């Protein structure tokens with residue numbers, strides 16, 4: 001089997017991407033944030049505290065003939081941005097892009113934090129990291145990918161995120177039309193439950209490539225590229241008037257600037273992030289200070305190849321017995 005679904009930016013900045021997902025019988029379609037940095041499929045629901053719902057589409061398990069309470073199971077998750085959610089668990093049929101899993105754990109939110117409530121466009125998350133991070137207790141549950149894997153034509157999914165445009169998540173196949181050149185594969189450590197890999201280095205603009213190992217995770221659920229402070233300082237030093245602002249919470253730059261590209265290494269291959277991808281717009285409405293898309297990972301305890309980096313590539317998440325990542329230009 002295979003599946004193919006379009007993923008759509010939630011706003012003009014590509015702050016996140018939503019992908020429609022069918023849950024239940026008859027189908028209830030919710031727009032979920034596919035997150036390769038977490039392992040819970042959770043949704044706004046008929047159980048969510050009413051004051052914490054503001055415009056999201058909810059899953060109502062009592063209207064699904066295939067929903068069953070997973071008795072005694074609870075979940076609770078905290079993300080890197082400080083947001084959180086928790087609740088109880090149903091099993092139900094879940095389809096993505098024509099690919100169906102029966103008996104998927106659908107984590108129904110009873111509580112969500114303010115950042116979820118305030119984002120009307122995201123109806124929940126679909127985690128695609130390793131199932132060892134799933135938060136369901138007392139019986140840990142599998143991700144949608146892990147439950148689909150054995151049925152897929154190939155045990156892979158691919159992320160093809162757009163810059164200010166829709167893109168695609170495919171399950172079970174490589175679309176050889178979706179990228180240029182060849183795919184370079186690189187080793188993954190699953191020890192922290194992430195798609196953790198080691199970049200071979202970087203370049204700023206037209207500058208020389210610096211060969212240096214940068215361990216980090218491929219995380220579709222993180223907007224920005226978070227890298228060591230040395231690397232980030234070297235990038236923003238090429239932008240006149242850029243500075244790190246403790247008041248704003250990262251590097252800012254004059255909105256009048258033209259940003260340089262940023263290149264990262266994948267083995268001997270190179271992925272180029274155009275400068276435009278690094279512009280996250282005014283810090284507040286009407287400001288001439290703009291927020292940067294490359295930020296320091298110092299204090300986060302891991303480097304994160306988020307959407308800024310991943311949307312410059314066609315990315316293969318290879319879930320074979322020994323997982324690997326692949327990157328191609330596109």
Ligand code: NA
Nearest residue numbers: 249280283291
């Ligand atoms: Na922000």
